[PDB]
Nucleic acid binder design. Structure first.
Ligand SMILES: O=c1[nH]c(=S)[nH]c2[nH]c(=S)[nH]c12
Length: 266
DNA sequence: CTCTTTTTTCTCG
DNA sequence: GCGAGAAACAAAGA
DNA sequence: TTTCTCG
């Protein structure tokens, strides 16, 4: 999941589990609780969920007054809300049980993580990861963005994916963003001129805010509609510009990369 | 049998 | 620094 | 790394 899907999950969770008391926590895969399942079980049991926030692709459960559970879904993490008597499915790893239902975390590839953090350690946690600004007009300052692009020789697609220029882009939306900004994924960022950087800046914000509006692309968050709006991701061999160009797929810095060669020249 | 495909972090030259 | 490659893991799809 | 797929 990328920022839009996580934000969709956040919103659904906010509606359903805020105000609920955690009755018990169970794990068939405790190793995904990086700070220690035992400790997490002991601190959070009996606590009431006060809210859910998000930073980039990270979910943040606000539980009791002094704890935060930071959850990352990585590649295939999924939450679902189920009755207390729901059967176990094969890749369920964790469950937070309430009085009248449970929240189950599943992850086929086991990449997803949980970390229990002190409330005043949350801001330092994201500082250490060097996570960039949220993709909004208010937080995503184009001037700093521009200064960083100009000082670097990195290719624009893997640089954007670093989460440091701006938070929340993953493989789908960076491909959609570069298509929309008419920029080649392998463009060296110090070659970008001012007007391209401006278009790229706005496009990053516009695409992500749109995806959020449509509930993300495709359990919680499984009713998204952004996938219908995708212009290049996963559409190899299909048309992009009303002239005849087909979408090409190449490998860039280890990632499958979809682009329209005629519209996205260097 | 083999290989490649689908977020974050680490190695290493 | 930097980037190429791989690690963590499961299930495809060839 | 493990298992499936027409296997
Ligand atoms: O956190 C990341 N760091 C790097 S270097 N690349 C990358 N690609 C995605 S997606 N996330 C990240």
């Amino acid at each position: 999941p990328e920022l839009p899907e996580v934000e969709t999950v956040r919103r659904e969770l906010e509606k359903r589990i805020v105000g609920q008391k955690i009755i018990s926590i169970e794990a068939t895969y405790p190793r995904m609780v990086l700070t220690g399942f035992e400790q997490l079980k002991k601190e959070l049991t009996g606590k009431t969920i006060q809210g859910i926030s998000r930073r980039g692709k990270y979910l943040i459960f606000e539980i009791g007054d002094d704890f935060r559970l930071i959850s990352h879904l990585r590649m295939e993490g999924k939450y679902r809300l189920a009755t207390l008597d729901a059967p176990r499915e094969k890749h369920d790893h964790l469950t937070m049980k309430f009085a009248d239902g449970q929240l189950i975390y599943a992850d086929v590839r086991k990449f997803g993580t949980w970390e229990l953090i002190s409330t005043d350690q949350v801001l330092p946690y994201f500082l250490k990861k060097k996570i960039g600004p949220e993709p909004t007009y208010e937080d995503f300052d184009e001037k700093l963005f521009r200064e960083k692009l100009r000082k670097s020789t990195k290719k624009i697609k893997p640089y954007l994916l670093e989460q440091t220029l701006v938070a929340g882009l993953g493989n789908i939306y960076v491909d959609e963003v570069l298509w929309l900004a008419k920029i080649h994924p392998e463009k060296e960022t110090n070659q970008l001129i001012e007007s391209s950087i401006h278009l790229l800046h706005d496009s990053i914000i516009e695409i992500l805010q749109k995806a959020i509006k449509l509930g993300g692309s495709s359990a919680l968050g499984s009713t998204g509609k952004m996938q219908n709006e995708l212009q290049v991701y996963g559409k190899t061999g299909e048309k992009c510009s009303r002239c005849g160009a087909e979408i090409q797929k190449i490998k860039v810095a280890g990632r499958g990369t979809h682009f329209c060669p005629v519209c996205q020249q260097k």
